[PDB]
Symmetry: D2
């Protein structure tokens, strides 16, 4: 149901908000909290494996997570697919396997393989516009259901280019068939993204990821012209802080008693596992 659900979110009024996750449990927590969908974060999934976010994990590993989350929740999954895992032929294979796994949208960025993630310091190399437009065209040609979305992510500002270049690239990617564009920035100031949104005059919706420019609200981003806001890695970052503090306290105290009232009870874990339904089906069918 994923791609149909995401199209309905884009076709209805209001700002769409999605949250990063790196396993089915995190996706289920975001769904329960009330997010509209899931972002299958390259950073969260890489970090969960103890590894760089630099196409060190393969498409097989990243798709494995995205697909397991897609089947675990009833909201759409939007996948972070780095640069598309190679050339236009890799992109087509990517689309076929992500679409078949029920992912609603895939996001590819205008860099070359292997991904240099946005937080690497210094000038960064961009893919040429003709080569990246070929990847976008190939993605649209490979998909089977028209509801599936291909999101073209613009790293021009990240890489050291100006807003004119970011808009030139976004307009080319839209012309190549991208269903949405994602303008990225790593400044504290939201102003470069607000400027992009104000100058964007094509019908394709714009996606934003306010990791660094966090002071701007989803409502303000929506009023400025963004359709979807991605909270990409806050679950991971919250988990790291809570788990390291928990482990430190257990070792220092020599027991868990002081943290028992500050962590999830086992009954909450069992609920998140679906144990009520599991036990009912055991009663019905296990003889």
């Amino acid at each position: 149901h994923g791609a149909a659900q995401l199209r309905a979110l884009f076709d209805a009024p209001g700002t769409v908000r999605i949250a990063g996750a790196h396993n089915p449990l995190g996706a289920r927590l975001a769904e329960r909290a009330g997010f509209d969908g899931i972002w299958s974060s390259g950073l969260e999934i890489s970090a969960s494996q103890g590894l760089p976010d630099a196409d060190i994990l393969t498409m097989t590993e990243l798709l494995g997570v995205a697909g397991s989350m897609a089947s675990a929740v009833g909201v759409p999954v939007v996948a972070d697919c780095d640069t598309g895992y190679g050339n236009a032929n890799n992109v087509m294979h990517m689309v076929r396997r992500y679409e078949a796994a029920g992912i609603a949208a895939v996001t590819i960025e205008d860099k070359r393989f292997p991904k240099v993630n946005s937080f690497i310091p210094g000038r960064q190399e961009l893919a040429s516009v003709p080569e990246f437009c070929g990847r976008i065209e190939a993605a649209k040609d490979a998909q089977r259901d028209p509801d599936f979305m291909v999101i073209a992510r613009i790293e021009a500002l990240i890489a050291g280019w100006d807003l004119d270049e970011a808009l030139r690239r976004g307009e080319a990617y839209a012309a190549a068939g991208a269903d949405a564009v994602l303008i990225h920035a790593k400044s504290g100031s939201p102003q470069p993204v607000l400027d992009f949104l104000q100058r964007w005059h094509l019908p394709q919706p714009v996606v934003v990821v306010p990791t660094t420019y966090h002071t701007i609200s989803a409502a303000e981003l929506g009023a400025a012209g963004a359709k979807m806001v991605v909270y990409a890695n806050h679950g991971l970052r919250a988990g790291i802080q809570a788990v390291s503090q928990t482990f430190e306290t257990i070792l220092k105290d020599g027991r868990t008693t002081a943290i028992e009232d500050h962590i999830a009870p086992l009954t909450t874990v069992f609920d998140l596992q679906g144990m009520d339904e599991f036990q009912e089906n055991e009663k019905r069918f296990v003889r």
Copy 2:
């Protein structure tokens, strides 16, 4: 080196403490905090996949996590292997694959496949002693490095049998070749496990998992006769509470600003990903024409 490291921990004085994890990042956080090793928790791993802890995930999926953690950290991984994934022949296949993946020890419990999590209420079925002893013998026969450990987990108290039955089973499992035994209990009082520890007289060390009887300290458990203490699911439970609250706050506030100072900074994530070494190696070896 995991198996050699775990044997050193058991052969040295002091109480060994290990923490549950369900991916390499959790294992690395436990190592950095100072735990002696990792517990590859069936509960944590199944919960992370949104699924019951009931042999719904397969050995393939559980080994994938245990092995990725074993290569990610420099402390031993002790694996929770449910009932051994079938009969003694499945147990042998399990030992071969887990040992090759660098896991230091595997734990199999005296129940029948598929596992019922110990916190399932009501009376639970135990494996017969001859059948489970064969699983233990098969495991010791399949391993290649003598340092590798097979831990026999005793669910007799969980299932509602008495202390003498738990002791009869543990002693049979030790005679069958288990390197250690794990006595489990789900009461809030530590006395049931304390009673087992006082009456255990064999040389094999005893493992305990104080999830429910959490008020007893590791030092007290060690003084009573336990050699290893397992904190099996507190990382998962802490993570669930924090992530839920984070997601709730982001949706309510309309932005993340109010939790930025209460979650790990990006630079901490990068450190945990190994980016210092990665960027050094990029500078050393990645070059153009």
Copy 3:
């Protein structure tokens, strides 16, 4: 799509023939030869991994192959699912994952976990009828598309029980919701399976696997009442013989020249990989 295709094969007249395969290439060869569908054989897949056919491979490993075959060919895949990988809760999990991966039908047999391959000698242990009927009921409850099929495999004759017992079990499995039954036997004579078909009065179709009683044709089995005939492991057995002989000849001769005219050319491999389309798409979309 697989399940609807398989229903169409069962709803139209004629004997359905499927072949065993253990990777997408084998499935594609079976499709090109003209088989109606694929059998995702536990024996072929376990043997391909050098391992016993005894639930040593896990559901994850067996599903990975079945699902990759289902996406690679345009004929339905019928999966060999051993005993269902545990109790009725495991069976439900299996159905959800196999259906999502586009498998058309799953086959579970009335034995206990872990499976003993039907060719293991001596008396074997059967699941109780109530317990197995619970697995069948759970499977039907877990599926989403009504076209998906659950095939109940009867091991009663394999295990040493008589025909009355195989029929009692088959009739119970049909009443529990199985879409088809598979009656197995391992003698050289087809008579035990023919005797079953003579006494089968239920509308559910019957599946047969004539590995040992190979002298009866698919058309003779169909004339006797069977609907689907499974050739379960002949591709693996042919490949083993040919690859062993090829390896021995290369070592003896010192070169491959004497076998070049008797093995597939690389152009055939490229065609099986879809290189014509791959190259066209490179021309259309890979740009500087």
Copy 4:
């Protein structure tokens, strides 16, 4: 034991011969026939999955096969690792994972990601010498056991360059630390490869893959100066022919009777599965 075994083969007199395989069964058949080791073939594995040999399969998928073969047989596995799955940092991650899985040697080629099977027509793109030397240096820095081997595969002839270019590339790769070089060629004549061997004066050994120039014997290649000869895809090609003919015959005849005496009996399959030892262990431990 694999890396030590392969070193012993390279250190002893004689020409090493290995055969391609794409699963543990095929490796076991090569071992039983008497091959010295296994070539974990990118063409055979991709083909077995119905897909192009063009880095469409990922490192995860290719390593899964190579590692399962390495633990299934008692001869060394030499892995076909395409271009190394990205840049020098991908190469390092590859080495760490392949070495931990017991693979004896990895082979990377001097092309850019994603590769094209050498049998693609026209001038092909080579990696620059500095960039590829950096991959080799990284691979050698990442390995832990000195017995593990990194084989530098030279695609210059495949790509339409002359012998002088293939030799100068090989010479640079050897100085960068490659343990052996593989000279590839797709002529029917063996003479280009013989001429490379005559003109190669360096101590690093040379690997050859006589797929197209199949008329030269292993003994003749060894006498000309090659140390290892790879029969890369004959098992797959023999299997395809036999399986297609088997399926055609079953459909035409209506039964398998006419092929029963011409395919492996089930007892041979059981032996290859290890059933004798499996049954003994059943008797020993299953109670």
